[PDB]
């Protein structure tokens, strides 16, 4: 018997992104080589199998800094972090390989699938 | 030049709700008279003008317990909290007045609007 507000989920994500831009209640720093990215643990877990495993680990859940594998490209991470908070993926010919390798590491199957399709079409 | 994954926002909300059910990374207890509700501060702020004001206040942002006005009905709050995490509002004839008064207090304009329309149509 429920009614549903169609735009609710996108509005929530819009506000979580505004919180991220203003640095409100961000509780983790993701270190990708020389770069730091402030984020909300719950949004990372809700989007990534890797962060879901990290932040449900009884020891890692309490860490304020998570260092990613040095093989991870910071631009690739940046694009995936923007995707997490906006549903929009800035996929380009110059970044697709780094985006795909980063999505595989972060466990983001939908991004991996779209990257594979854009690669196969070119091819 | 971005591409968009249509279901991303609803999937994120689905996962935030699964985190809430399992009590993962919940960081605030909302006390509504005799009842307690565990939630994520960021989801509350992203959905409610009242929680947005509370959790951006330099002192209240650090509180782990927020007590609501004793006039607030716990079932009404419960229904709005489920709406926040699911986009579905369990609106019924027996709960509509409490739901509407709670949405006005929490500052959730879209819920207030739909409640007003269901009231006007009846009557």
């Amino acid at each position: 018997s429920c009614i549903q507000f169609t735009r609710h989920a996108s509005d929530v994500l819009l506000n979580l992104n505004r919180l991220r831009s203003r640095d409100i209640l961000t509780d983790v720093v993701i270190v990708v080589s020389r770069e730091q990215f402030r984020a909300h643990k719950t949004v990372l877990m809700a989007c990534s199998g890797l962060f879901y495993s990290i932040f449900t680990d009884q020891l890692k859940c309490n860490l304020s800094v998570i260092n990613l594998d040095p093989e991870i490209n910071p631009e690739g991470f940046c694009i995936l972090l923007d995707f997490m908070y906006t549903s929009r993926l800035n996929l380009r010919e110059g970044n697709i390989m780094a985006v795909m390798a980063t999505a595989m590491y972060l466990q983001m199957e939908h991004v991996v699938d779209t990257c594979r399709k854009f690669i196969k079409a070119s091819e | 030049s971005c591409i968009q994954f249509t279901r991303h926002a609803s999937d994120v909300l689905l996962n935030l709700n699964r985190l809430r059910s399992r009590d993962i990374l919940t960081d605030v207890v909302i006390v509504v008279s005799r009842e307690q509700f565990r939630a994520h501060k960021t989801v509350l702020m992203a959905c409610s003008g009242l929680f947005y004001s509370i959790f951006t206040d330099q002192l209240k942002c650090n509180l782990s317990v927020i007590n609501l006005d004793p006039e607030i009905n716990p079932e009404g709050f419960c229904i709005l909290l489920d709406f926040m995490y699911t986009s579905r509002l369990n609106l019924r004839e027996g709960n509509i007045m409490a739901v509407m008064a709670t949405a006005m207090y929490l500052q959730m304009e879209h819920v207030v609007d739909t409640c007003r329309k269901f009231i006007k149509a009846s009557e």
């Binding site: 429920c2 009614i3 549903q4 169609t6 | 509002l89």
Partner: peptide
């Protein structure tokens, strides 16, 4: 907006 889901 509101719809029947």
């Amino acid at each position: 907006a509101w719809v029947i889901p």
